[PDB]
């Protein structure tokens, strides 16, 4: 009577069809059954990493006892699962909880071999009294049956520490599945998610969601990882199955927003962007109608959009908009890095490759060191590459290895071993890529680093993933590693390579991509830097209505008297502020150069006055 | 009825316009509605560096529910924000806390899913024991109680990721900070509220 | 004055964090007009190297400065006994109304390769971890002080590598993982190289 | 005088919540003043529960909480727990010079004549 | 003797508050004396910290005595307290003072040994 009060009944819910089929895993079912039919010590315990399915094995056993495919002495047993939550409730008196436990064990004693007790997550029993000890004469007499299932590390922390009980437990390792069997599991679960929603599921989704979740999402285990993408793509489609779709929604909300702001200001400007956005939203709307005039199930693309929206990693089917980007990408990237066309054509050649699905599955997608003399653009290039992959330039993960000059400073990027001072804190590299890995990593001046950090970057490359002093393996399999230097600094093309072979080990140069070598600058390719500096200067002081008028003789004169092919384009950026900035900075706070003015510059034989 | 005594009610405060207007961020609202309406394991967690707006998303969800822009099976489901500070008020004896928590869970499950619970700063849910905070573990994975949370990014890996049995039953929804261009729109939106409190 | 405007925002961001970023509202432009001649009451001569130090202050208070660079990072050297330390304590006199509120570190002691750690901190797991650096935790409190570097010759060429991202970026790190910004301090470097070159 | 004797499980938490409900109950009168507020962090050593109980109350501005901690006992405790760090504004009090310290000394020259009749 | 029985929360704190309240309960005639006070910094588990407002307000007189080697390792690293103490320095004496002191203690050992 008390088991009816406190505990539960799987067999009650088993006869009502209130579970799901456990198609698969015959071996562990037969193992647990055969251990349970022993004369003595029939206490099985399932131990395995979480999420592989351990409750589902006991549910399949309950289904099989209801059906009757079991061997001999397992007819009509009605497996009862206890409820340790309700055991401790309102028992605020002295000798009450042990008497409730004694009443339940007395209710277990009378029936001979029917009831199979099933305590789930049995590592709570070690405490939970102040009690919880009245098991030893019970298991010393074979009455209790005690099927259970804990997780992997939580077993050895409590129970093996408290080893007086573990001799009365036979163990079973639960094995995780692979990619092949997960598809056969997902075929047996399609028939329920069709019923819970108003959707149908193509088997292409059941192929692609099992394949695509193996590479990208690396935190979980296979059986329940694959259910998530299907079960949430169904919800996304059910959102779109309702009356009006997406995008159009995006644009409607956006134009309503800009409308709000604009009318509140009543800026022009936005007035234009309103109109343009109204043109677009019009076009799409018409297109929508057209299509209608001319989907109700999940396809391949919905799994791709779920895995793209979550975890930040873009992986779709090249949805018609980035084809405008990835072919124009050279000219669009050459708006901030002038010259170095042979280098842009090789940096661009590692994004179009890995975007189009031809690249290697265990490799960082870009890993290439580029070097030469100074003032060329080898630092400006990375902050120009990360200007349209992210559409903002402050979203770069940048470390500087000009500070790691000695041996022990590895630990500010790999974390301390556990049990030390900094273990709350963690590393600065490991715990900044595990949070949404897609970013671009830099290494400013890899030369002056100590030559033992490099034996950490050997398994950053060539494997894809690294360990830390905490117990995780974060993977860099889809980042873009970039290394900079100034090595050689005077070699034509080969003394640089001799210096690189002298300083780096050959088994580190072997693992890279094409080591680029930059060339410098040219007199004609300097004027295009000059007018970019001047337009950036105008954009800086665009806040006081103070535009400029530079005549082409003055812009020509800026190219000449700061030129030298030994410091790059750095002296020009000082010469601009030595010519303009002195006189402008003095006169601007001296009155008379007030707002709403287009001040010119004119050529003088030494300066250029205002 | 027991949730009257250990909870606030954000929907009841939203129904008199006592919440600051939430402007921006359609993507995170659509993502929360997508995750919260699946079949099993339906409980997201908002995660981001602090100050970027994570309470603002849940208040925007409450505004959008009371307005009614949601799909069909999300309409008129009040968001009852729970507590764990007020629940361990009188808890001296050996069984009162677990009784109180089981009363709360029974009162939630007794409904038909009409309630969306909201534990803000759920990195305190591990403790309060002495076991406790472990009897909620079977209820999460079955899919009954809908739970929305908000942690900082660096208390998460200290209090929750240590306890890997729990964190499998969540859905991490990352929230990143905006740029300047959206902040100008946010500041144009919230301009009217401070002009009324300070008469300027 | 019956509504807020773009000036009081600058007043708030001045009075908090201590950085003077206003408009020079008619009072202290009278000071910065006379700075090549006000500074001459304590330094005599050296006229071509006061008209440049007196220029990285005026162009940084007009708003023409490069917003990701220190406002002035220049190195002056020469023979001994000239006034190259007296100048760098005299331009810290009218900016601060004192002469002891500057970050005066001395790199005459960093002969070996492992005194980096006293100005950059220590990586976690080691003995003095919660101490920061000596260069780092004197800026993060008030990010406006002028910084000296006395006799940079004697440092081993490893300290220059630490100093290399101070210039032209403005940020460095420490053990705790914070990027302290040197975007609006005036770095000053002294030396005595050659001391009589033609 | 609030963690005074609290060896029972819920004894501290209802005490603190009673103090906070009394502060919240009155009509915006009471401005609290906690001195040495770095002791907020390690309040109830149970598993962090106490100290960050008042975190959903400071964001709405319900208790005005003027505090005073030193410079170097701040980036050891409060910067460690940066969810609290953005609730607090900061006022930087630097030392004066001699030119005003003379004026500060000249006004306190009355209480020392009382306690020592000289 | 004040951390004798404590494996709890708030056990040491009440035991300390009763002593401070019995001090300031009385009037000013309970000059205290903590010898070897370098064990006042730790003993937390936050403790040794109810005493900081009481020091710089003039309540307990607190003659202390630390050795110089243990001082700069345990107190000067924790500089909130070092402005709550005046540092009376005791240097070692010379020879003739020690001869006077040894003439002082000639009486006692003759009682302790009949020589």
């Amino acid at each position: 009577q008390a088991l009816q009060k406190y505990s539960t009944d799987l067999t009650a819910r088993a006869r009502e069809g209130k579970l799901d089929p456990v198609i698969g895993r015959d071996n562990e079912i037969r193992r647990v059954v055969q251990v349970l039919s022993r004369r003595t010590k029939n206490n099985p315990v399932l131990i395995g990493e979480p999420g592989v399915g351990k409750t589902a094995i006991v549910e399949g056993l309950a289904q099989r006892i209801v059906a009757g495919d079991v061997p001999e002495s397992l007819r009509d047993k009605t497996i009862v699962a206890l409820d340790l939550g309700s055991m401790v409730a309102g028992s605020k008196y002295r000798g009450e909880f042990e008497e409730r436990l004694k009443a339940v064990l007395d209710d277990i004693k009378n029936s001979a071999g029917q009831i199979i007790t099933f305590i789930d997550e049995l590592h709570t029993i070690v405490g939970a009294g102040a009690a919880g000890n009245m098991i030893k004469p019970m298991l010393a007499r074979g009455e209790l049956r005690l099927v259970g299932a804990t997780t992997l590390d939580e077993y050895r922390k409590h129970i093996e520490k408290d080893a007086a009980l573990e001799r009365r437990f036979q163990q079973v390792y639960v094995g995780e599945p692979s990619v092949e069997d997960t598809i056969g599991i997902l075929r047996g679960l399609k028939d329920r998610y069709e019923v819970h929603h108003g959707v149908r599921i193509t088997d292409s989704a059941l192929v692609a969601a099992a394949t695509l979740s193996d590479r990208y999402i690396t935190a979980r285990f296979l059986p329940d990882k694959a259910i998530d993408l299907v079960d949430e793509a169904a919800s996304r489609l059910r959102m779109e199955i309702d009356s009006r779709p997406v995008e159009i929604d995006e644009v409607e909300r956006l134009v309503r927003r800009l409308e709000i702001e604009e009318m509140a200001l009543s800026l022009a400007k936005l007035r234009s962007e309103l109109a343009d956005q109204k043109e677009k939203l019009a076009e799409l709307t018409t297109r929508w109608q057209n299509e209608k005039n001319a989907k109700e199930e999940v396809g391949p693309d919905d799994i791709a959009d779920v895995v793209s929206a979550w975890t930040g990693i873009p992986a779709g089917r090249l949805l018609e908009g980035e084809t405008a980007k990835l072919l124009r990408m050279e000219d669009e990237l050459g708006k901030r890095v002038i010259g170095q066309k042979a280098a842009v054509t090789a940096v661009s050649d590692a994004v179009r490759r890995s975007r189009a699905g031809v690249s290697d599955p265990n490799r960082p997608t870009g890993a290439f060191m580029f070097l030469g003399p100074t003032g060329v653009g080898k630092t400006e290039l990375a902050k120009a590459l990360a200007d349209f992959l992210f559409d903002d330039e402050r979203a770069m993960v940048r470390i500087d290895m000009s500070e790691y000059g000695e041996k022990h400073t590895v630990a500010r990027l790999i974390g301390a071993p556990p049990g030390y001072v900094g273990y709350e804190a963690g590393g600065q590299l490991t715990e900044a890529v595990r949070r949404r890995p897609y970013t671009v990593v830099l290494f400013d001046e890899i030369e002056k680093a100590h030559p033992d950090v490099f034996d950490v970057l050997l398994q950053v490359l060539d494997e894809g993933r690294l360990t830390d002093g905490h117990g995780r393996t974060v993977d860099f399999r889809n980042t873009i590693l970039i290394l900079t230097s100034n090595l050689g600094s005077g070699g034509s093309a080969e003394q640089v390579l001799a210096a690189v072979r002298a300083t780096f080990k050959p088994e580190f140069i072997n693992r890279l991509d094409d080591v680029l070598i930059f060339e410098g600058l040219n007199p004609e390719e300097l004027v295009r830097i000059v007018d970019i500096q001047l337009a950036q200067l105008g954009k800086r002081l665009a806040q006081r209505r103070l535009q400029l008028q530079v005549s082409l003789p003055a812009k020509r004169w800026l190219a000449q008297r700061g030129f030298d092919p030994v410091y790059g384009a750095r002296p020009l950026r000082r010469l601009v502020q030595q010519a303009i900035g002195d006189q402008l900075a003095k006169m601007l706070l001296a009155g008379q150069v007030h707002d709403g003015d287009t001040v010119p510059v004119n050529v003088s034989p030494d300066a250029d006055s205002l | 009825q027991a949730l009257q005594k250990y909870s606030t009610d954000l929907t009841a405060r939203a129904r008199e316009g006592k919440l600051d207007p939430v402007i921006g961020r359609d993507n995170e609202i659509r993502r929360v509605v997508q995750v919260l309406s699946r079949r099993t394991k339906n409980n997201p967690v908002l995660i981001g560096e602090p100050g970027v707006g994570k309470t603002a998303i849940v208040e925007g969800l409450a505004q959008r529910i009371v307005a009614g822009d949601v799909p069909e099976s999300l309409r008129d489901k009040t968001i009852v924000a729970l507590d764990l500070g007020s629940m361990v008020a009188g808890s001296k004896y050996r069984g009162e806390f677990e009784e109180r928590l089981k009363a709360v869970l029974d009162d939630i499950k007794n409904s038909a899913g009409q309630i969306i619970t909201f534990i803000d700063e759920l990195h305190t849910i591990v403790g309060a024991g002495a076991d406790a905070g472990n009897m909620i573990k079977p209820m999460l994975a079955r899919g009954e109680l809908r739970l929305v949370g908000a942690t900082t990014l660096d208390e998460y890996r200290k209090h929750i990721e240590k306890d890997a049995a729990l964190e499998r039953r969540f859905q991490q929804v990352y929230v990143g900070e905006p740029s300047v261009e959206d902040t100008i729109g946010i500041l144009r939106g919230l301009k009217d509220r401070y002009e009324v409190h300070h008469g300027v | 004055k019956e509504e807020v405007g773009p000036d009081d925002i600058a007043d708030v961001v001045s009075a908090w964090t201590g950085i003077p970023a206003g408009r020079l509202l008619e009072g202290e432009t009278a000071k910065l007009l006379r700075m090549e001649d006000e500074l001459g009451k304590r330094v005599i001569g050296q006229k071509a190297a006061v008209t440049a130090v007196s220029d990285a202050v005026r162009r940084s208070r007009a708003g023409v400065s490069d917003p990701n660079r220190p406002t002035g990072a220049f190195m002056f050297l020469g023979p001994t006994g000239v006034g190259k330390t007296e100048l760098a304590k005299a331009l810290a006199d009218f900016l601060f109304d004192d002469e002891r509120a500057m970050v005066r570190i001395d790199m005459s002691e960093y002969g070996e390769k492992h005194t980096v750690a006293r100005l950059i901190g220590a990586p976690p797991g080691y003995v003095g971890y919660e101490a920061g650096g000596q260069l780092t935790e004197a800026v993060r409190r008030r990010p406006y002080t002028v910084v000296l570097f006395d006799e940079i010759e004697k440092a081993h060429p490893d300290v220059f590598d630490v100093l290399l991202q101070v210039l032209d970026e403005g940020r460095l790190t420490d053990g705790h993982g914070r990027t302290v910004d040197f975007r609006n301090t005036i770095l000053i470097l002294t030396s005595n190289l050659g001391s009589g070159g033609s | 005088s609030m963690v005074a004797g609290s060896k029972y499980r819920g004894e501290f938490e209802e005490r603190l919540k009673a103090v906070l409900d009394d502060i919240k109950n009155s009509a915006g009168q009471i401005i609290t003043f906690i001195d040495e507020l770095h002791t907020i962090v390690g309040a109830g050593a149970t598993a962090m529960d106490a100290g960050n109980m008042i975190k959903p109350m400071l964001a709405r501005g319900e208790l005005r909480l003027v505090g005073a901690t030193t410079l170097d006992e701040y980036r050891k405790h409060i910067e460690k727990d940066a969810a609290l760090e953005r609730r607090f504004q900061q006022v930087y009090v630097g030392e004066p010079s001699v030119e005003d310290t003379i004026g500060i000394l000249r006004g306190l020259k009355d209480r020392y004549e009382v306690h020592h009749g000289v | 003797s004040m951390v004798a029985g404590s494996k709890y929360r708030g056990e040491f704190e009440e035991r300390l508050k009763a002593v401070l309240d019995d001090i300031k309960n009385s009037a000013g005639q309970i000059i205290t004396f903590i010898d070897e006070l370098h064990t006042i910094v730790g003993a937390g588990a936050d403790a040794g910290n109810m005493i900081k407002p009481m020091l710089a307000r003039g309540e307990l007189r607190l003659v202390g005595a630390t050795t110089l080697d243990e001082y700069r390792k345990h107190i000067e690293k924790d500089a909130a307290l070092e402005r709550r103490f005046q540092q009376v320095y005791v240097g070692e004496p010379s020879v003739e003072d020690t001869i006077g002191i040894l003439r002082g203690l000639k009486d006692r050992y003759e009682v302790h040994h009949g020589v």
């Binding site: 605020k92 008196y93 002295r94 000695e406 030390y420 | 004896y93 | 797991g125 003995v127 | 029972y8 | 929360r9």
Partner: peptide
Amino acid sequence: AAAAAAAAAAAAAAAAAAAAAAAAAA
């Protein structure tokens, strides 16, 4: 007719630190 009144507890175990001991390399 008395009660139980389950009391609380407090735990502590500190951390270590290492030193590097540079070598003058000649």
